[PDB]
């Protein structure tokens, strides 16, 4: 029932994705690679002392700090939600094979009993109202670019100067490209302006994943991760197979001479997609202004910073429901892309821009290396973009596409199961906008705090409260999906954007507090996703620019966890046993070295200026800028720090571009 076309690297369609330069040619051909990450300078993830440390620590902490999660998934007591065995992976060595990305998610959605469009007129008005509220009265801002990020297809440049030139040229030629696409001239738009082609698939590590200890055998068991073979991916699951990837690490001894202790596994690998930068630049020029609007006007629902910022909102609720979405990106509906595009057109957005936006969400995908002897295949024909992959991770507005889908999905759930008395407030477009604008500001008796697939749903006192409790009960039972749009359940140990909601004996939001997740501190410190990249001279271009700095923000981030001191002492004791060294002293030296190095990058910082002016967010972001992609935003970071990590295209060029896109 319609298989996606697939082309080998040798085919002209795939060759046209890679420019005649070394980096682009190497990206096309790069074979499956694996190896121990440099966890910290001079320390490999597979160092026997380090693995001994992880074995002792994971065992000790699980033993002394068992999970304290009630029947309703509320975390209490010690603030622990699971075992500490997630650290037991051979970081840098992936599970084999990684998945082939599904070319079409239509069958996947239909088989999961999810809708192929808005179910009712109300829902149609609410999704359209979300577009109207989000894309409205936008103010131009400079187009900010992450330092060291790739331009991907076709140039594969990491040079800031080249990236600035590409973005400026893209804003100049986006109209001409979009008009070519409106005429079905995708090849011309790509050939002339590099707008089109495909997403470049890279496989990224999820460094920690579920591991359990079988009491009967005393053997560890890793969580099975289902992967699609090539046949399954091109047929949207009609043919081929979906099977468990192998996390068995025994192979490392034979292949690499690495001693593998018992109960240590290969890492979970996730697909990540890099977009063609010339196509993303015009999209990002609108996406950043949208973020600024939603994080300002709709800050209640959308702008999340500290544990206290979150706590102030939640404390006022009579009921707090922490939801979970199954595989958000792969289930994300193409009908939403079409609805968004249709509404933008109705608002008066430039048709050429809407076509670029639509095209970015139908684009083919170039598969690199999921396993040895596999990959190097283009899925979909770039001459006529028609894929249904769900949400591509490298699309210029992915966060906004997930936020738009989910914010409405949760409101619909609250309407359907708890507040039918509010349905009369949604009669047409003006009333749908008025209602949504009030709801997003936290002015209704039904509330939410969300970001993409993470949310907390609230009820104050009122008519909807009783329904709220029935919905929570329905979730606990887990027999009926409460949504026609996505697979929704409750989170087993409710947390929001990394902070655990710690309840007391009362099990009420009013007396509950947000605390940092101690397990995330452990994940970040002992299982980083990337190595230190010691060979990359420019630290601002590394995946972990200043790792040592995280020690300075630790107490601020994690200090409120009931077991904070206990964990730090357990670390010290175990590190002493494994290395014969003080972990605290080791981290204090790393903090000193990184603080000194940082002044080289900050113009306001003198040769030995300390971290006095820096916030804990600034420090966490400098140690892990990936937190800027899922946890925080540009506005949450000090201005002098933002400039270390990003560079921008002038507001003059974006202002002129934006004027041509927008209705008014
Ligand atoms: N802990 C962690 N998660 C990440 C990171 N980068 C991306 N994620 C994503 O966050 C999700 C993992 O959830 P968890 O490890 O259980 O905890 P969390 O996302 O950090 O926070 P909560 O969902 O509020 O519980 C996946 O969808 C990941 O792809 C990272 O650096 N650290
Ligand atoms: Mg959650």
Left if phi > 0, otherwise alpha if psi is -120 to 50, otherwise beta: which for 283?
alpha
Experimental method used, please?
A: X-ray
Contact (CB, 8 A) for 488 and 413: yes
8-state DSSP, 628: G
Closest CA to 473 of 79, 73, 112: 73
Gap between the Cα atoms of 222 and 220, Å rounded: 7
Domain definitions of the chain by residue range: 1-30+102-276+333-397, 37-91+518-606, 277-332+398-517, 607-664
Q: What would the two tokens of residue 583 be?
A: 């972990």
Query: In 10 A of CB 558, how many CB atoms?
Result: 21
Contact residues of ligand 1, CB 6 A cut-off: 206, 454, 495-498, 520, 523, 529, 626, 630
Closest ligand to Cα 518: 1
Gap between the Cα atoms of 21 and 191, Å rounded: 16
Measured in angstroms, how far is the CA atom of residue 332 from the centroid of ligand 1? 18
Contact (CB, 8 A) for 300 and 437: no
- Per DSSP bridges, beta strands 319-325 and 454-459 are antiparallel
The minimum-distance atom of ligand 1 relative to the CA of 491 is 25
The minimum-distance atom of ligand 1 relative to the CA of 529 is 31
Measured in angstroms, how far is the CA atom of residue 520 from the centroid of ligand 1? 8
Residue range 607-664 forms a domain whose CATH class is special
Contact (CB, 8 A) for 515 and 497: no
Q: What would the two tokens of residue 528 be?
A: 């980083």
- Known binding residues are 453, 490, 494
Task: Report which secondary-structure segment, H or E, holds 187.
Answer: helix 186-193
Resolution in angstroms for this experimental structure?
Answer: 2.9
Task: Classify domain 277-332+398-517 by CATH number.
Answer: 3.30.70.1600
Contact (CB, 8 A) for 532 and 547: yes
Angle in degrees, 0-180, between the axes of helices 160-182 and 351-360, rounded to the nearest 10: 110
Q: Which residues pair with 379 in a beta bridge?
A: 6, 365
- Which position has the token pair 């007391």? 504
8-state DSSP, 539: G
Contact (CB, 8 A) for 276 and 16: no
Best substitution site from 206, 620, 621 to test ligand 1's pocket, by max atoms within 8 Å of Cβ? 206
Peptide bond into 97 cis (omega under 30): yes
Task: Report which secondary-structure segment, H or E, holds 337.
Answer: helix 334-347
Contact (CB, 8 A) for 181 and 189: yes
Measured in angstroms, how far is the CA atom of residue 74 from the centroid of ligand 2? 11
Distances (CA, A) of 35 to 91, 252, 266, 268, 389: 8, 10, 11, 14, 30
Right CATH for 37-91+518-606 from 1.10.490.60, 1.10.10.2840, 2.60.40.420, 3.40.50.10800: 1.10.490.60
The CA-to-CA distance between both ends of the chain, in Å, stands at 44
- Per DSSP bridges, beta strands 199-206 and 365-367 are parallel
- Which position has the token pair 């990936």? 626
Four-residue CA torsion sign, 391, 393, 395, 397: positive
Measured in angstroms, how far is the CA atom of residue 624 from the centroid of ligand 2? 21
Phi, psi of 367 (to 5 degrees): -90, 120
Residue by residue, DSSP assigns 198-264 as: -EEEEEEEE----EEE-TTT--EEEPP-EEE-HHHHHTTTSSS-EEEPB-B-THHHHHH-----TT-
Residue nearest to atom 22 of ligand 1 (CA): 498
**Does the fold of domain 277-332+398-517 match that of domain 37-91+518-606?**
no
Q: Could you tell me the strand order of the sheet in which 495-496 lies?
A: 495-496, 499-502, 513-516
The minimum-distance atom of ligand 1 relative to the CA of 270 is 29
Task: Report which secondary-structure segment, H or E, holds 377.
Answer: strand 377-379
Gap between the Cα atoms of 39 and 433, Å rounded: 49
Residue nearest to atom 26 of ligand 1 (CA): 206
Measured in angstroms, how far is the CA atom of residue 323 from the centroid of ligand 2? 6
- ∠495-501-502 over CA atoms, to 5°? 135
Measured in angstroms, how far is the CA atom of residue 592 from the centroid of ligand 1? 29
Task: Report which secondary-structure segment, H or E, holds 648.
Answer: strand 646-649
Closest ligand to Cα 494: 2
Closest ligand to Cα 454: 2
Contact (CB, 8 A) for 489 and 73: no
Q: Could you tell me the strand order of the sheet in which 265-274 lies?
A: 6-8, 377-379, 365-367, 199-206, 265-274, 89-94
Distances (CA, A) of 166 to 143, 224, 473: 12, 42, 53
Residue nearest to atom 18 of ligand 1 (CA): 498
- Known binding residues for Mg(2+) are 453, 490, 494
């Amino acid at each position: 029932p319609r298989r996606a076309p697939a082309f080998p690297l040798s085919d002209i369609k795939a060759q046209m994705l890679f420019a005649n330069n070394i980096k682009a040619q190497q990206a096309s051909k790069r074979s499956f690679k694996e190896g121990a990450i440099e966890t910290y300078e001079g320390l490999l993830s597979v160092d026997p002392r380090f693995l001994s440390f992880k074995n002792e620590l994971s065992r000790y902490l699980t033993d002394h700090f068992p999970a304290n999660v009630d029947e309703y998934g509320r975390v209490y007591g010690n603030g622990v939600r699971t075992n500490f065995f997630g650290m037991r992976h051979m970081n840098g060595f992936p599970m084999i094979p990684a998945t082939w990305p599904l070319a079409s998610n239509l069958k996947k959605r239909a088989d999961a009993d999810l809708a192929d469009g808005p179910v009712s007129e109300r829902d149609n008005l609410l999704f359209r109202a979300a577009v109207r509220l989000m894309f409205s009265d936008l103010e131009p801002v400079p187009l900010k670019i992450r330092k060291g990020s790739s331009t991907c297809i076709p140039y594969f440049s990491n040079d800031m100067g080249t990236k600035i030139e590409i973005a400026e040229r893209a804003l100049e030629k986006a109209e001409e490209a979009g008009n070519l696409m409106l005429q079905g001239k995708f090849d011309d738009a790509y050939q002339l302006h590099q707008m089109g082609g495909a997403y470049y698939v890279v496989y990224r590590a999820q460094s920690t994943d579920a591991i359990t200890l079988d009491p009967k055998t005393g053997k560890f068991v890793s969580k099975d991760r289902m992967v699609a073979d090539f046949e399954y991916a091109v047929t949207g699951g009609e043919q081929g197979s979906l099977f468990a990837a192998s996390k068995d690490a025994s192979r490392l001894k034979e292949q690499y001479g690495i001693d593998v202790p018992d109960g240590f596994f290969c890492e979970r690998r996730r697909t990540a997609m890099g977009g063609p930068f010339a196509l993303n630049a015009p999209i990002m020029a609108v996406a950043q202004p949208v973020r600024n609007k939603i994080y300002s006007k709709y800050a209640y629902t959308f702008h999340h910073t500290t544990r206290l910022n979150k706590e102030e909102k939640v404390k006022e609720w009579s009921l707090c429901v922490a939801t979970d979405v199954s595989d958000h990106d792969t289930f994300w509906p193409g009908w939403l892309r079409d609805l968004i595009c249709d509404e933008l057109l109705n608002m008066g957005y430039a048709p050429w821009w809407v076509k670029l936006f639509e095209t970015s969400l139908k684009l083919p995908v170039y598969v690199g290396a999921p396993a040895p002897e596999q990959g190097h295949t283009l899925l979909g024909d770039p001459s006529n973009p028609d894929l249904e992959v769900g949400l591509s991770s490298g699309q210029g507005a992915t966060d906004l596409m997930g936020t738009l889908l989910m914010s409405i999905t949760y409101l619909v759930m609250q309407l359907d199961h708890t507040a039918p008395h509010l349905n009369s407030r949604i009669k047409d477009m003006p009333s749908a906008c008025r209602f949504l604008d009030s709801y997003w500001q936290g002015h209704e008796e039904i509330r939410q705090i969300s970001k993409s697939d993470d949310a907390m749903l609230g009820w104050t006192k009122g008519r909807a409260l009783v329904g709220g409790h029935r919905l929570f009960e329905m979730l606990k039972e887990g027999k009926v999906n409460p949504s026609p749009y996505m697979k929704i359940s409750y989170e087993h140990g409710g947390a929001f954007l990394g902070d655990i909601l710690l309840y007391d004996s009362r099990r009420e939001p009013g007396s509950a507090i947000f605390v940092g997740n101690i397990n995330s501190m452990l994940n970040n410190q002992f299982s980083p996703e990337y190595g230190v990249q010691s060979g990359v001279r420019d630290r601002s271009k590394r995946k972990r620019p200043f790792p040592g700095l995280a020690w300075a923000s630790m107490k601020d981030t994690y200090g409120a966890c009931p077991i904070y001191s206990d964990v730090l002492e357990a670390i010290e004791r175990c590190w002493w046993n494994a290395f014969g060294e003080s972990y605290r002293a080791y981290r204090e030296d790393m903090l000193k070295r990184d603080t000194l190095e940082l002044s080289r990058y900050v113009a306001s910082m003198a040769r030995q200026a300390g971290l006095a002016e820096l916030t804990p967010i600034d420090l966490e972001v400098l140690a892990d800028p990936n937190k800027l992609q899922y946890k925080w935003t540009e506005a949450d970071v000090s201005a002098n720090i933002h400039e270390v990590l990003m560079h921008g295209v002038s507001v003059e060029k974006t202002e002129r571009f934006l004027r041509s896109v927008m209705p008014r």
